[model samples]
Target chain A: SLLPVPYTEAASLSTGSTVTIKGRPLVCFLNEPYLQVDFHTEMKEESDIVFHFQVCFGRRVVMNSREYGAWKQQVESKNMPFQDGQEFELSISVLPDKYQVMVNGQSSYTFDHRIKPEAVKMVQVWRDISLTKFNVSYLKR
Target chain B: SLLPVPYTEAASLSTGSTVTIKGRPLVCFLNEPYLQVDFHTEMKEESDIVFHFQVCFGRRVVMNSREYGAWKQQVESKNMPFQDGQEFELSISVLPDKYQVMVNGQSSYTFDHRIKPEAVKMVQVWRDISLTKFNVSYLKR
Candidate 1:
């Protein structure tokens, strides 16, 4: 059976914390299915989103934020690093200036701090993929 | 004040567990500086070592094991992929067949299972370089 796939959880967002997501696209996936990772201010509805990383299969990766009920301009990346039925690792390292996002093993994108990073209380992952591993660790600096 | 480096205590092992090591080589480093990652059966002296990953600067990489007071033949790789004073990410994903090692976003080498994968009770890092991140996680399969 396909997993009840939208995995969401509360997370600690410290300066040296890292959130790693490892999974693969479902075999025979849809043309435009996407995986969206959101770091939000709270777990409740309509909370401010500090950072959003969305990857649409065969399309583009969009990075943005939601503040005061408004969606900010999207930071787009043409690099689509995921393949169907292949495992991938996405690591988001929290830095003082920005969130360093590494796809597979390379530095793929950086989301500048628009909201205070410490305000992020939850990390949410949703949409068309099978998650094999998701974890967060506070690394020693 | 010096920052604390991450080190592993006695840890369990499984097929889906991945170990991520991020660090930088010391500037003006020694001619034979190397990072050795050992998968051991325990933390005590005279414990069995299942896998030994040694990467020597300006030299080759050696992978071997020590079983019952004897060292196995070294598996050597001529490709050495570290630069002095630069950041590097090394990921070792445990698979059923072997440990797939990726260096700085590229597939570098694989150490086949010489000992039972579950026999690995600890992961130890020794020798030169500064460790920024060291963590191990078992992903959902």
Candidate 2:
């Protein structure tokens, strides 16, 4: 493993900010490994989430937000761009109107902002993937 | 961590068999930690699963079977006996016609036999809980 899973990092984001993650699923596609990225409003794990992106590899993806300790509307996508059993590059960029997700350099999904991007205080990447790289663009601020 | 998570063991079960697991949630219940026990038909992770038990701490439980690489009807239970922010004991007993699950000494849920217990070749315990102990009883014939 490159870095301990359920990786957490204190972070901040704005309209022009981008979060990049590189990782590989710990298991093959037949086992249905998952990958999750959460943008939290606080450093605490239980804090409200500004964005929740979860993928069931080779299956569907679900995006949602948890505010005031309750989950809000869920957005689901059936995009299957992630290759089975291969490392992937995931980039999430915050736009003025929505969050754009790029998987392996292809625009795969997008979610309209439910909470201001500036509300994010932490980023957590977890679940059945071994993370190799995580970075937040600071030059755009 | 007492034992590595996503624990896998070669296991067998019969009418009087019992699988007992003792573990603590890696995160608080508010964060919805998960515990999963999967009974596989082969040593390979991608093989069919006779029984799949998953718990969302303080939320709900789901039981299902995967056959021929496809998931069957899912069983959902909102009966949660797991306490928040505490260690718990989970036991699953194999009966003649069903699998009974006990949480913290209280019988919580059951699943009718979807696949023969004799068909199980491996047991995998994984997800967001730190396991301290896991055992499958073999005393009775």
Candidate 3:
């Protein structure tokens, strides 16, 4: 609620780092709202993406990576834990092998580390959602 | 920038009505911003759409109608009149046979009447842009 849409923050990711986001979809699921979070290698908006997470509310979720200005293979998921017209807590934990995703405290999806988490220098959260909180834990680093 | 994004206004459209939108993309061209305008039969966000216009900046545009809660045949356009990173003046003029779209004073796209312009009761403009102005013209009607 305090943050803006299309919010950007300089961030770092590594093993044991957890990127936690608190937000809610602007419109109901029937309207097909979207939420996107990108972990970029640089502060620039066009920089390479270490991980890209996108959700089409009430439909599907897609994840991919962008390297050197070109997008790589894509992944899709249909598992939805987000409730209609409700706030959601999303946690992305960096592991040695993959990124574990927890939606509302329930494990929902995972994506392997296509690029090292160390490459992430910025995180951008955007599209049809209102963000209330964003955090990157550094305690374990 | 006086108007809030995801702007909505109760409006009426006839054969000569026009919906004008003035806005700038939130991100640069490489980031693929989006702009959407929908003419609906009611004010509710999930109401059936009389006309749906969507733009994927730096890529393409898609037009369709959601009647009886089901999307009709999709119409795609490759028109690229919208300049990257520049504020655009978009006008959708309701014609007897179709809706004529003007981008920055240039005729860019058109959609033939599907549900009749007289059925529109509200207009909503939203997605990936900062709005400066929005109006539904009644002068020509």
lDDT of 1 by residue, B63-134 (tens): 988898678888999986776657789999888889999999899889889988789888776444567787
State each candidate's clash count: 1, 0, 1
lDDT of 3 by residue, B49-71 (tens): 98999999999999999998999
- Please report how far candidate 1 places residue B29 from its true position, in Å: 56
- Ordering by DockQ: 3, 2, 1
Best by lDDT: 3
Evaluated at residue A38, the lDDT of candidate 1 is 85
Candidate 1: how many backbone clashes?
A: 1
Name the 10 consecutive residues with the lowest summed lDDT in model 2 chain B. Answer: B26-35
- lDDT by residue (tens digit), candidate 1, A41-91: 887534778998888776789999988867888899988767655778999
What are the per-residue Cα lDDT tens digits for candidate 3 across A1-141?
369889999998889999999998988787788899999999999999899999989999999999999989999999988999999999999999999999999999899998999999999999899889999999984
Q: Which residue runs does candidate 3 get wrong by more than 4 Å? A: none
Error of 2 at A30 (Å): 3.3
Cα TM-score of candidate 2: 0.94
Candidate 2 Cα deviation (angstroms), residue A92: 0.7
The candidate, 1 or 3, that scores higher on TM-score is 3
Model 2, residue A18: what's the lDDT? 91
Measured against the true two-chain complex, the DockQ scores of the candidates, in the order shown, are 0.01, 0.56, 0.76
Residue A52 lDDT (model 3): 93
Per-candidate TM-score against the hidden true structure: 0.47, 0.94, 0.98
- CAPRI-style quality class for the chain A–B interface of candidate 3: medium
